[PDB]
Design a protein around this ligand. Structure first.
Ligand SMILES: *[C@@H]1O[C@H](CO)[C@@H](O)[C@H](O)[C@H]1NC(C)=O
Ligand SMILES: N=C(N)NCc1cccc(I)c1
Length: 535
């Protein structure tokens, strides 16, 4: 019953939300987060679920309702493929930490090991990169010290190569035949609650809680926090990768997508809040232990959780049991999230091409073995730089633009009243005025604003104290545009491939393929003002 908390929690909420929150202060990130969850996240979540469940198609072939928008399905499939590259490397880190967490002297506790620089500092006898946990993550896991930047990235690390190989083999044998246990669905919440309890009882964590609950508004005057919050909203819920549409493809018709959207968004909100709470309790405790400030006590990159959660584990009694339990939780959660993403990709491209649906094993090998070879850039010596580049640009302005185009193609060109009648046929009740106003007007306007301020207010990409070269930002914007350009390219392809006059081309591009016999009789809904004045 209610296998929804095992979809409402994913590696985003527990790995990416921590550093996005910490990077943007305390609750100054939580105000835009819940705002976008109320006006944009939940409406588009419910819209994607209803679309997939009604049309019975994946992310690419759901756009037979307005053919000019299939480029958006291609774009979200490419977003998912881009995210998988650096997303399986986080699972490789999880597996390496789980393998290293089977000793009784955890390697992130003392710093008399071999991966330690002569500049270590121990609070048991600061610059937040000379601590045993940070020096284990950077030099004992990543081997980042052997890399001068993103230009000088070495060869893929051997042991991380083994971990990534295991991860990719597991993903293949999970996805090679199946169309897709509850303990791996409730263990995230158990671990998060244990961590919350210990964090609130930690010494020095009151300061972290005060810093987390403190809402500074000069940070809200700027635009970085809003773009971060929007991107995290569409990264956590999954709207923008084709995962919700591909998973609703297999739902029953009478399934209540409304209550699933409501409950998933609510669990996501409370889970992210409790996750930030635990994270900042650990951060306050770390600032107390290392005798520094909370603002410069840890990294603001993707490896923040691999320094925070080991540091909290190192305090609990029986630290090895909790290390093993936490990293099994993280590994299983990441594996489920990656199964979801790769199954979104495979379902989209297999409902699009029937030869890809017939050869499920070969196509799964092609999708998995390609994200393995391209994840070899993120497991190099300077692969944290490639992972930062991808995390910044693979799902950035791209996913916002993609969900904006989904909302537009469903609300304005397909019809929001047509979509509402579809939903009323599926479940039995019209969505409601709040939902239609968010689908048609509110969510598209906010998404357009965020995309525009994301393109016009763009900060150059940096790691902790390392500035990426300009060509790195050019490469990142090329990665972001490789998906945002699929929509106009498909519009121009579908326009230059439809026989007929200009108006017949427009009609055939905006009319669902199920009703392409109407254009012959010149009966097009979108060509009347009544269609666009439907609220
Ligand atoms: C350690 O600190 C010294 C400062 O005297 C510096 O010269 C050296 O490069 C540092 N080694 C590292 C960061 O590995
Ligand atoms: N659960 C969310 N929101 N994302 C998970 C995800 C997305 C794209 C690709 C992969 I691999 C995994």
């Amino acid at each position: 019953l209610l296998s929804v908390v095992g979809f409402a929690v994913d590696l985003a909420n527990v790995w990416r939300f921590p550093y996005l929150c910490y990077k943007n202060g305390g609750g100054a990130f939580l105000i835009p987060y819940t705002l976008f969850l109320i006006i944009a996240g939940m409406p588009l979540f419910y819209m994607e679920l209803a679309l997939g469940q009604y049309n019975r198609e994946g992310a690419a072939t759901v756009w037979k309702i307005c053919p000019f928008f299939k480029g958006v399905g291609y774009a979200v499939i490419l977003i998912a493929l881009y995210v998988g590259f650096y997303y399986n490397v986080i699972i490789a880190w999880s597996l390496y930490y789980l393998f290293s967490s089977f000793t009784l002297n955890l390697p992130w506790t003392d710093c008399g090991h071999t991966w330690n620089s002569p500049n270590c500092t121990d609070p048991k006898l600061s610059k937040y990169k000379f601590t045993p946990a940070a020096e284990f993550y950077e030099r004992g896991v990543l081997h980042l010290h052997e890399s001068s930047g993103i230009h000088d990235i070495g060869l893929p690390q051997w042991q991380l190569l083994l971990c990534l190989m295991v991860v990719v083999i597991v993903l293949y044998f999970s996805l090679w035949k199946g169309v897709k246990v509850w303990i791996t669905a409730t263990l995230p919440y158990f671990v998060l609650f244990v961590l919350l309890v210990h964090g609130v009882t930690l010494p020095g964590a009151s300061n972290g809680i005060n810093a987390y609950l403190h809402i500074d508004f000069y940070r809200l005057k700027e635009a970085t926090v809003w773009i971060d919050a929007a991107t995290q909203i569409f990264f956590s819920l999954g709207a923008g990768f084709g995962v919700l549409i591909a998973f609703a493809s297999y739902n029953k018709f009478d399934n209540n997508c409304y209550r699933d959207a409501l409950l998933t968004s609510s669990i996501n909100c409370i889970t992210s809040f409790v996750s930030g709470f635990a994270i900042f309790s650990i951060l306050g405790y770390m600032a107390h232990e290392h005798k520094v400030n909370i603002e410069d006590v840890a990294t603001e990159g993707a490896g923040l959780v691999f320094i925070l959660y080991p540091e909290a584990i190192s305090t609990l009694s029986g630290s090895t049991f909790w290390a093993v339990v936490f990293f099994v939780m993280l590994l299983a959660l990441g594996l489920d999230s990656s199964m979801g993403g790769m199954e979104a990709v495979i379902t989209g491209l297999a409902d699009d091409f029937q030869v890809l649906k017939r050869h499920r094993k070969l196509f799964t090998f092609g999708v998995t073995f390609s994200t393995f070879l391209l994840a070899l850039f993120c497991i190099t010596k300077g692969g944290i730089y490639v992972l930062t580049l991808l995390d910044t640009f693979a799902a950035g302005t791209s996913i916002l633009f993609a969900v904006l185009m989904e909302a537009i193609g469903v609300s304005w060109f397909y019809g929001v009243d047509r979509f509402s009648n579809d939903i009323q046929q599926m479940m039995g009740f019209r969505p409601g005025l709040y939902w239609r106003l968010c689908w048609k007007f509110v969510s598209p306007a906010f998404l357009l604003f965020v995309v525009v301020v994301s393109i016009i207010n763009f900060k150059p990409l940096t790691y902790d104290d390392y500035i990426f070269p300009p060509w790195a930002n050019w490469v990142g914007w090329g990665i972001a545009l490789s998906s945002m350009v699929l929509v106009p390219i498909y519009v121009i392809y579908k326009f230059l491939s439809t026989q007929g006059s200009l108006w017949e081309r427009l009609a055939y591009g905006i009319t669902p393929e199920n009703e392409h016999h109407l254009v012959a009789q010149r009966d097009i809904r979108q060509f009347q003002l009544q269609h666009w004045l439907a609220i």
